[PDB]
Paper text:
KtrAB is a cation channel with a nucleotide-dependent [name] domain. The structure of the KtrAB complex revealed a homodimeric membrane protein (KtrB) assembled with a cytosolic [name] octameric ring, formed by the [name] protein. [name] binds nucleotides, ATP or ADP. ATP binding induces the adoption of a square-conformation by the octameric ring and increased K+ flux activity through KtrAB; ADP binding results in a non-square conformation and decreased flux.
We introduced the single-point mutations R16A, R16K, A80P and [name] in [name] and tested their impact in the complementation assay. However, and contrary to our predictions, none of the R16 mutations had an impact on the growth phenotype, while [name] resulted in an apparently inactive KtrAB. Crystal structures of the mutants that did not rescue the TK2420 growth phenotype (A80P and [name]) reveal a different picture. The ATP-bound structures do not adopt a square conformation, displaying L1/L2 distances for A80P (at 3.9 Å resolution) of 52/23 Å and for [name] (at 4.1 Å resolution and with two different half-rings in the asymmetric unit) of 34/30 Å and 42/27 Å. In contrast, mutants that do not rescue growth (A80P and [name]) also do not adopt the square conformation in the ATP-bound structures. In contrast, in the maps for the [name]-ATP structure we do not observe obvious changes in the main-chain trace that might explain the impact of the mutation in the conformation of the ring. Overall, these structural results reveal that E125 coordinates Mg2+ at the intra-dimer interface. Mutation to glutamine likely affects the coordination of the Mg2+ binding site, changing the stability of the square conformation and explaining the inability of the [name] [name] mutant to rescue the TK2420 phenotype. Next, we removed the chemical groups that coordinate Mg2+ in the R16K and WT-ATP structures by substituting ATP for ADP or mutating E125 to a glutamine and measured flux. Relative to KtrAB-ATP with Mg2+, flux was 14-fold and 24-fold slower for KtrAB-ADP and KtrAE125QB-ATP with Mg2+, respectively. To explore the possibility that choline is an activator we analyzed the impact of the [name] mutation and of ADP in the presence of 150 mM choline. Both KtrAE125QB-ATP and KtrAB-ADP display low ion flux, with rates that are 12- and 16-fold slower than for KtrAB-ATP.
Author numbering:
A (entry chain B), B (entry chain A), G (entry chain B), H (entry chain A): 6 to 222
C (entry chain H), D (entry chain G), E (entry chain G), F (entry chain H): 6 to 140
Amino acid sequence: NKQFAVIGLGRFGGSICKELHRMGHEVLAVDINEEKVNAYASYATHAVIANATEENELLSLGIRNFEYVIVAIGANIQASTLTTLLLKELDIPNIWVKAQNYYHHKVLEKIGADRIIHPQKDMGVKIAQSLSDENVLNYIDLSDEYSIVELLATRKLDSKSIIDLNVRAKYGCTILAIKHHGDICLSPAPEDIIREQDCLVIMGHKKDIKRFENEGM
Amino acid sequence: NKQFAVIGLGRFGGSICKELHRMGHEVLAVDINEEKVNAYASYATHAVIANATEENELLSLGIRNFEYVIVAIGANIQASTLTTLLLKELDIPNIWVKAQNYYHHKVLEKIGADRIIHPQKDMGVKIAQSLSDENVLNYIDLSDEYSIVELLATRKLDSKSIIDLNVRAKYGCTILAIKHHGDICLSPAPEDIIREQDCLVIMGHKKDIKRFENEGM
Amino acid sequence: NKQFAVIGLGRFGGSICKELHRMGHEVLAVDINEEKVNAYASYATHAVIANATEENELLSLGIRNFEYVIVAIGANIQASTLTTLLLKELDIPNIWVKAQNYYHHKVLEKIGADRIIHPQKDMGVKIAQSLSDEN
Amino acid sequence: NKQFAVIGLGRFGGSICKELHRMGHEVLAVDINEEKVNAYASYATHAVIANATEENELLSLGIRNFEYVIVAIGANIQASTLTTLLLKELDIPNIWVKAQNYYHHKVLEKIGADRIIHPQKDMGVKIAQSLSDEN
Amino acid sequence: NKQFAVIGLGRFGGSICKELHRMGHEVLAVDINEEKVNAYASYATHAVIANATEENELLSLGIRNFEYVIVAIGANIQASTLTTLLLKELDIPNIWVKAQNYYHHKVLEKIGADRIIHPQKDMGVKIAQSLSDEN
Amino acid sequence: NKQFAVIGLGRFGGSICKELHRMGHEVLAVDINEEKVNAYASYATHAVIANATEENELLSLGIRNFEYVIVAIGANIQASTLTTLLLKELDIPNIWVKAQNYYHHKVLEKIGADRIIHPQKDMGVKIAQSLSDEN
Amino acid sequence: NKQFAVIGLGRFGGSICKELHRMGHEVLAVDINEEKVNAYASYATHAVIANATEENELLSLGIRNFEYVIVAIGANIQASTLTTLLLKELDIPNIWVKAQNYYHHKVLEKIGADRIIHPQKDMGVKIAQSLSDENVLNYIDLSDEYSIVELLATRKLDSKSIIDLNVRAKYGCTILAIKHHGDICLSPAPEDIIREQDCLVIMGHKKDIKRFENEGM
Amino acid sequence: NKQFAVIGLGRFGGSICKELHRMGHEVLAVDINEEKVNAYASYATHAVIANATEENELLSLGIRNFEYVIVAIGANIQASTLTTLLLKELDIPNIWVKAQNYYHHKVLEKIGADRIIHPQKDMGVKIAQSLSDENVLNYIDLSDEYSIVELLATRKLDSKSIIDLNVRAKYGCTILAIKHHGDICLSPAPEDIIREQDCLVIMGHKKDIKRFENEGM
Ligand SMILES: Nc1ncnc2c1ncn2[C@@H]1O[C@H](COP(=O)(O)OP(=O)(O)OP(=O)(O)O)[C@@H](O)[C@H]1O
Ligand SMILES: Nc1ncnc2c1ncn2[C@@H]1O[C@H](COP(=O)(O)OP(=O)(O)OP(=O)(O)O)[C@@H](O)[C@H]1O
Ligand SMILES: Nc1ncnc2c1ncn2[C@@H]1O[C@H](COP(=O)(O)OP(=O)(O)OP(=O)(O)O)[C@@H](O)[C@H]1O
Ligand SMILES: Nc1ncnc2c1ncn2[C@@H]1O[C@H](COP(=O)(O)OP(=O)(O)OP(=O)(O)O)[C@@H](O)[C@H]1O
Ligand SMILES: Nc1ncnc2c1ncn2[C@@H]1O[C@H](COP(=O)(O)OP(=O)(O)OP(=O)(O)O)[C@@H](O)[C@H]1O
Ligand SMILES: Nc1ncnc2c1ncn2[C@@H]1O[C@H](COP(=O)(O)OP(=O)(O)OP(=O)(O)O)[C@@H](O)[C@H]1O
Ligand SMILES: Nc1ncnc2c1ncn2[C@@H]1O[C@H](COP(=O)(O)OP(=O)(O)OP(=O)(O)O)[C@@H](O)[C@H]1O
Ligand SMILES: Nc1ncnc2c1ncn2[C@@H]1O[C@H](COP(=O)(O)OP(=O)(O)OP(=O)(O)O)[C@@H](O)[C@H]1O
């Protein structure tokens, strides 16, 4: 199918490998720690003990073969950098590397990493958003002003109809989906009911959605 | 407004504090490392050097007053645990704690943490998804089967109309938004054009969207 | 007869193991320190070197079989806690744990220890009783 | 009534002092750690900050007057030994000392401790008894 | 004449600065260690305390003006790399960097160092030559 | 031909050993770090793991036989000094030692090193010469 | 002859063992460090690796047999104390122990050490004496006021006769010995010559000897 | 008077400083350990916290002024050596240094130490001598063969006269002093009595004195 190499079986890397394997892709799980290799042996096609900074070992893995190589080492800067460098000289098409700090990001950038990821930082932003605002479950920003938001229904919204909550006119926003007890209703008709604790998917302007949150729920 | 305490100014915690401060909330940034306190001094209301495991220091902070306290210590299990326990005994309403592994999650759960977060793991799942599928830019899962997906337009979609790409009947999915050169089109009419490299927002069943990705783009 | 597991062969744990062995019960003496295992080899049925916080080692001991498991680690809070949690998830009937301080007691309590003991403290109470009353 | 000196306000020593105080005996609570003195101030007749290994401080306490002196220092062997020694040379009638291990027990024995206690070991025996017999 | 910037006043860098100064070139001696700046104050045109990894400080030095910049930091790999990088993005014509090991050489190479020097290795070759031939 | 001993397989020492071996001289490569010995195994006649400060090991190497011994340890002053002293007492004809700073140079001088080298410093002089004069 | 056990082959203990062996006495050199046993193997009757704090090893040495046992462990207080204790319970006649500090001295005293020695302290006193007074080579105090002193002859005393330096009347002191180029003259007659740099042995009152040092040499 | 610097307030150095101070000399007590400085504050003219290996601190002490500087650091070879070298370059007249082993002695020698002392070794020799021979209390060697010895009187010597014990003819040795109950008799006449447990001071050849010990006492 497509070949993936996950170097460094941390929480982040390990999650990558496990999830990728669940999708049924060819995933090579590489780690210097034997116990890590033993741990993710069930969740990969091939799990190998290797020092990714050692070139001959990298050739012994046959890493040149892979379309995507992921350096999920984000604590040991030298290891990460060196590995990424090795992969670059070996003409790997896509090199995605986990970064620790802004400067590690810089060195990864300059030695030609294709994509650099900061997991804890970004998730930090997200959880912070959820922190200042206990309401929102999830969201995606379409632009600086417009956004699609996933909301947890409160005791203002139980047994209320879509026509009752006229968001399309009163607030200029549109409801896209309702999730009730795992069951899912896409682009629901105005007769449909929202029960409390259900997932509600609204779409519109940020300030408008906030308005609806305030007076509506 | 509402009072927030961020204990542990790492990447995750630090991001929390910085972002929260950008929203204009009262954020107390607490850390045992002096340099961390000095670093986030600009991005908080009050930045204090404190050992969060030391109770008298915790009273010196006056943490009982705060609605939300965040333990963003995820490397030092003992520190995190001890701190969370301290906060619980001090009757803090909402305690959100960063966890490292499944068992640290367990002990946090058992000592009554209100919300436990695994940043690297979750972000790992996400980036893994982006890894197996170079196309998807972003997404949100409405349920186990249904999802809203943001897609990067290829040359197969250039100069194509919404009515030309009949997703609502042929694939059972619905287009929600088109982002062209930063400009944004919400719930676009069938006459609208999609140019390549633009952001496309489709909504529907996972496999159906996959199907559309396959034959359409 | 009845199966007992004593994890942590200190003075306290070691005393438990030695005494129980004197009563003729099946006692598994577990310790990470090799010299401890060697020391109480005579005073147990089976004495094993194991890291009780490592799950696979805990399965290698076959601890699920035991009716009573005693965590006599009272200096290393993290070890004690982690181990107790491991035993709880492994559905051990009776988990008795040695505690150091009030908060270690709290975390043991919350992760569902069946009995928590403070040996030195209680002994303080006892010796005080003996002091007030020489009889 | 009878005068007791408790040197070292740990869990064990602290328990001794607190309990003896509940039974209404004259108990002098001595500790080098100020916060310990502050903690047991409510549970003693006189609570003093003192380095029990320093002789002049021991004379400043007026320890020669006391019938019973209890050395509840069981982590710091040197401190325990030295203190016990000071008390012995000062002709104290009854010196009861908390011991850590068999050899600290030995040195306490040889410098003439009147009663040596091993809290964790003995309590180990007890809790083991409680284990074999849930009643 | 020609402008030289020597970042890192070690033995190697310091020698560069001192000697260049003896030949009468405009040499800016930069160091984070104040005492190093004080030491080579006599042997430079301008000696400045600066963190060469901090960009705003690098602009405060006005390093863009210089034809040659020498990174004589060879113990602190991160500092060396970061500084060299800063200089590269600032379009410096000639960047000569002291390297520690083969891989630091590699990263310097990839971030586009113009000349990389290994003092101990090369000098090793030389002294070896002097050994085989005493003349 | 002529026998050379290179103690300390760094970049500098390693360079000496490698180059000398390329010239086809009998070179004994000695290092306390096993991986170093393994690294320069191809570039020497005999590569041995040895603690050069330990005299009996130095006799086990049979270092008295060698005309030239090179101490290429320039980070660990104590090791360098102690080794040089050992070699001097063992009546080695030519002892060339890598030095770190002026005082290490002084102590090497006083314990009678035959030649003291400062590689990085001198290299500083050289690169400065090359900078002033691009030709 | 007489049997000696030297436990702990340090500089002090090692010197004891070596010197004792030079006198031709039966010396058992005991140490836990193998290399120490190997080092003093030539300078003892029997050199054994043993943990002197372990009782069964002490019986394996047969230490009960020895008239004198010397604990020359002065860094490791616990080891020293414990060993001394072991020897005491085993009814060793003479136990001489090296001490580190005043309190280690105390515990050794109370567990019944027969002789306690402080080498560095005493030698410290001596070298200090030599420090304030560059003249005196050696001495022995007969009492608070009276002493026998060994002096290094200066350029005041060369080619001077004993009758010339009338110490017995002018200073009340008496010359006992003259050491010239290793050759030795005991209780010398008044005709004898003292050459410079020779050893001179005077006897008398301290202040008087000082007087002679001042005006005489 | 004369100025002394004692660097390193150990047992040896500390004893030096204390004793020197008792003699009423100007003694500068230098140590890197603050508590050591605090301890010997009473027993010196000036007690200073200083790193003796740091040159600028050594100039801050003004050590160039002192006639005698003593390096009593004998555990930390590097510190001792570096310090001694510093003092030498600073043209100090007399540098006396405590040594640990033969090679530390060698390096001190080569960097031009004026006097090198081995306290534990020498005291070891002495105590060893007292060990093989329970009789000798003290002694001084005049040469390889001749010596002055202080002896503890046994019951064989009780109530015996100097003329009764004819050492001057029978053994070729001469009695110099008798110490009875603290009272002291210098160069005693032949009528004088020696009572047991008294101090006896004999002078002569080593083996001759040994002979007298054997048959006499
Ligand atoms: N040079 C190397 N070669 C191969 N594997 C390595 C190398 N260096 C580190 N690893 C492995 O990569 C993994 C990276 O995790 P690390 O300990 O760096 O923390 P992290 O990746 O930031 O945390 P996590 O990924 O668990 O959130 C480690 O488990 C480690 O065993
Ligand atoms: N006992 C403690 N009391 C107060 N602060 C602490 C304590 N222990 C750690 N911290 C601080 O909390 C922060 C937590 O970051 P840590 O070094 O644990 O990595 P992390 O938080 O897992 O990673 P990230 O930087 O992504 O958050 C650190 O900056 C540390 O200084
Ligand atoms: N993680 C662990 N796994 C296995 N054994 C352990 C672990 N931690 C400690 N132990 C062992 O448990 C024993 C407990 O003794 P410890 O040193 O904790 O003193 P204590 O238990 O507080 O007091 P006592 O010695 O009277 O029991 C020790 O001998 C130690 O070797
Ligand atoms: N030399 C000393 N002089 C006076 N007090 C001391 C001295 N050394 C220790 N202490 C005090 O005596 C107390 C003895 O407790 P320690 O820390 O020795 O543990 P412990 O007593 O064995 O534990 P527990 O709390 O179970 O009794 C301590 O609180 C300490 O402050
Ligand atoms: N980030 C930095 N910014 C500015 N100056 C630095 C930085 N890092 C190190 N320096 C300075 O540069 C100098 C480089 O010397 P360093 O300590 O790295 O040893 P070196 O240069 O390899 O040794 P040598 O003296 O042989 O050159 C040091 O004096 C240090 O103070
Ligand atoms: N006491 C010792 N005995 C034997 N080998 C040693 C000893 N000390 C250091 N070495 C070895 O000598 C080599 C010297 O390299 P070091 O790490 O000292 O850098 P350097 O010599 O200053 O610079 P370079 O690496 O360029 O020679 C090291 O590889 C080290 O393993
Ligand atoms: N428990 C023990 N059993 C046997 N030998 C021991 C024991 N502990 C220490 N030793 C040995 O006794 C010797 C005592 O020397 P230590 O290291 O204590 O310094 P020291 O005796 O004060 O110094 P020195 O005697 O060299 O002047 C050491 O060489 C050590 O190997
Ligand atoms: N670099 C240094 N600069 C200044 N003082 C030092 C330095 N290193 C050690 N000292 C001090 O010198 C003293 C030397 O004693 P050390 O601990 O070396 O044992 P020692 O002198 O061999 O034993 P003793 O107590 O018998 O003299 C110590 O008290 C220490 O604090």
